[model samples]
Target: HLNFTQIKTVDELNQALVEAKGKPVMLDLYADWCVACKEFEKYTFSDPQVQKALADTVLLQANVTANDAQDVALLKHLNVLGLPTILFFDGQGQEHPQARVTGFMDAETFSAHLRDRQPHHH
Candidate 1:
């Protein structure tokens, strides 16, 4: 499993983003009740190619399993409507809306997506 940095609050998320400056950030909005989220963790995220594609990115996962107040607030703050949403931030901390993923995808597909979202670095 990827070592996803767990963030529960807005503050923590902000801090993580700040610390991950100059690196692309992949913040995965996941929940225990979301079956697709598990599919991503098992099938997509576990793939070797997908793992290598995200080598330089800072991985972050927020578990909203309980759906508590904090979780709801965090969702609202991020403007995330549902679970299994994967958002990407560029090295400049800019959101890459076109690269955002909302459902299950195979490793091959995800690897291609990563290429599109990857920063222009030689």
Candidate 2:
């Protein structure tokens, strides 16, 4: 299962980051209509190795299914243009733009990405 804390609003995201400080953080943008998001959930996120790789990070997901006010605000705040967007943040809550994933990546590819870009929390 995808064990991720769901954040609804931008404020919640900010709070989660603050509460999860000193740890690498990943923010996932998801939408029910997004094909890539479904692929990620089934293929990438279902991989055990991929799960292990992200074991140390604070995993958070934002489901913008309704495109409601809170959802829109959060997406706008993060400047996320679409679904299946993954944002990485260091231990200090500093986002790593270079590590952003905007497309569908297979399990192996995503695992490599985790190894290569795993942010140091300390």
Candidate 3:
């Protein structure tokens, strides 16, 4: 797995997010109680090809089950009403409108989404 910084607290995430600047932030929103989420992470992040594809952007993981202050803040800010949601924020910290993918997508499918061409709106 890539050495992505684990974002557990709201403060840590917000700080990291601010420092993320204009780089796109790829978030893996997960729940500790979700069995599928674990399987997906195990299979997805461990894939060499998946790792290569993920290199295209900055990646982070968020645990929604903890109900931490940061998680609450993030959910409120992002208007999240679901678990296991993958959200993509552009370099300017603006969310990509059609950039969210939910459920347990396979590594290949996830890789394809990462490889899809995006418009240079920056």
Candidate 4:
């Protein structure tokens, strides 16, 4: 199962950095008020292959609908102008050297995206 932790504070992001131990972090930025976020959560995360692949990294869920303090700050930090986005961070708790995902993606594509980043794939 994919363990999705809702980031309630910025401190929690720092905590995840330590607990994650250099493992890449996948931040699922969503809002309860977003229809696309709801659809992706219901469909994309329900896949078994994606769940298995996700075990290779740390996953977090940021809810913007509830107006979570930390989540709000992160959205500002990342300059996220929209919901249903996926942000990938490097091992050092730094964001990847590229743009984050905005639209929804299938399990296979998402898996491949992460898979290519795996050390073994290099």
Best by TM-score: 2
Tell me the tens digit of each residue's lDDT in model 1 across 41-104: 8999999988987888899999999999999999998888877889999887788777889888
Q: After TM-score superposition, what is the CA distance of residue 2 in candidate 2 from its true location, in Å?
A: 2.0
lDDT per prediction? 0.88, 0.90, 0.75, 0.75
Ranking by TM-score: 2, 1, 4, 3
lDDT of 2 by residue, 1-122 (tens): 77999999988999999999899898989999999999999999999999988898999999999999999999888898887899999888999888999999999999998888844845
Distance from true location, Cα of 33 in model 3, Å: 0.9
Worst 10 residues of 4 by lDDT: 113-122
Per-residue lDDT for 116 in model 3? 68
Cα lDDT of model 4 by residue, 1-122, tens digit: 45888776677767877787667788888787898787776777778888877777789877778766667788777788888788887777777746477877777777677776636211
Model 2 misplaced regions, further than 4 Å: 118-122
- Is 3 or 4 the stronger prediction by TM-score? 4
After TM-score superposition, the amount by which residue 52's alpha carbon in candidate 2 deviates from its true location, in angstroms, is 0.6
2 versus 4: better lDDT goes to: 2
lDDT of 3 by residue, 17-103 (tens): 788876777877788897777877688878888887767577888877878777788778777777778888777666774878777
- Between prediction 1 and prediction 4, the one with superior TM-score is 1
